[PDB]
Amino acid sequence: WEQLSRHWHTVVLASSDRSLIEEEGPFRNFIQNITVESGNLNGFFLTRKNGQCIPLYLTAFKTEEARQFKLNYYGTNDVYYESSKPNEYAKFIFYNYHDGKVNVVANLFGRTPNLSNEIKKRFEEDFMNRGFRRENILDISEVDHC
Amino acid sequence: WEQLSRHWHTVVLASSDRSLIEEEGPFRNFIQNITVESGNLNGFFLTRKNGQCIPLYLTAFKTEEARQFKLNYYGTNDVYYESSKPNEYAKFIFYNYHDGKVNVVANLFGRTPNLSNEIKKRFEEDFMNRGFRRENILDISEVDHC
């Protein structure tokens, strides 16, 4: 898992709940880098709250299950890692349970600040195919993230 | 996946939406057996619809990600397999996308029509912890089914 131990860029964000990833949303976070320790993912993000960029430390604890991690943040998040190009991008999918509800927050991280269209298009399609609206898929490689 | 190709039993079912697994629900299915072919999971089930038991064939198609499959059934289902004792029980978590809503359907299968209390207990706890209530977790080893 030491491969994920690098600098990253939040390229695209999508969620079944628009508000989770819009300005001021708990998941509108910009990854800076990931440090792997004993299989655990220690991510350092920057999130913009009340107009300012503040540090955010999130730890995806490795579970006995493969590619799966556990993260406690605004509820319990079952986390899944996936990538067809491990050296170029990383997708992190969060299944969030909070206040008796289930949501999905999908993250498209890139080793570069932007990714190829083939990659982004696949991400967009995968989620549009799952009933999402286009307002639920944010391509932030365009916006002004922290 | 050779340990999955045998006869299975649906022991406990859990869902974020209780109706999906209650009587008449599209996901209240009683597994008969699973046959593996080319990496895909070909499960044969029995489901009581409109009064009686009828055959049900579902294929969990392999993906490029470890332990993850795909199933089109009452929406798109991203299926994950996990099990600490591969020869006693099998767990399949479905992340269902239908009508813009996201739901989770977890299945606890066993080589025998019932599982140890410890196994069932942990399954129940895991989802009790994710905000599910007692009525969302149905042990069916007890009730009579197809």
UniProtKB/Swiss-Prot annotation, chains A, B:
Major localization class: secreted
Disulfide bonds: C53-C146
GO molecular function per UniProt: small molecule binding
Cellular compartments annotated: Secreted
Keyword Disulfide bond: yes
Keywords from the named record: Disulfide bond, Glycoprotein, Milk protein, Secreted, Signal, Transport
Carbohydrate-modified residues: N33, N114
Lineage: superkingdom: Eukaryota
Gene Ontology annotations for the cellular component aspect, listed alphabetically: extracellular space
Distribution of this protein across tissues and organs: Milk.
Quaternary structure and partners: Homodimer.
Family affiliation: Belongs to the calycin superfamily. Lipocalin family.
Protein name, entry field: Trichosurin
Parent-protein start and end of this portion: 35 to 180 of 180
